[PDB]
Amino acid sequence: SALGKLQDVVNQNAQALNTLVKQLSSNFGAISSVLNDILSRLDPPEAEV
Amino acid sequence: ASVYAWNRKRISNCVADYSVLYNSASFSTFKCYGVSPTKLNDLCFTNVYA
Predict the structure, then answer these.
(1) Measured between alpha carbons, how far is B17 from B15 in angstroms, rounded to an integer?
(2) C-alpha dihedral over A14, A20, A25, A29, to 10 degrees?
(3) Any CB–CB contact under 8 A between B41 and chain A?
(4) Is B29 an interface residue toward A (CB < 8 Å)?
(5) Minimum distance, in Å, between the CA of residue B10 and any CA atom of chain A
(6) DSSP letters spanning A1-49
(7) Partners of residue B49 on adjacent β-strands
(8) B43 to chain A: which residues are within 8 Å by CB?
(9) Residues 6+ apart with CB under 8 A from A20
């Protein structure tokens, strides 16, 4: 337990990157969270929305 | 059938050809939500309701 001041520094960075990765699984209001399905399912004039 | 007793048909195990439907000019209204009609040929679906 003495090296907590050195362990939390790594832990916080590990949390931040993980939350950044998790943001790839959000729709943000769109119809799908993956960019390939939108291009493979919608017309070019419409998918830009 | 009438409106209050509308029918429903299962659709599965199909080589579905939507080109004939879209290319036909007999339909006054043809509106698709969430899918582009020209892209209907590429996609695959597990089940279809009519």
Answers:
(1) 6
(2) 150
(3) no
(4) no
(5) 23
(6) -TTHHHHHHHHHHHHHHHHHHHGGG--TTSS-S-HHHHHHHS-HHHHT-
(7) B10
(8) 40-41
(9) none
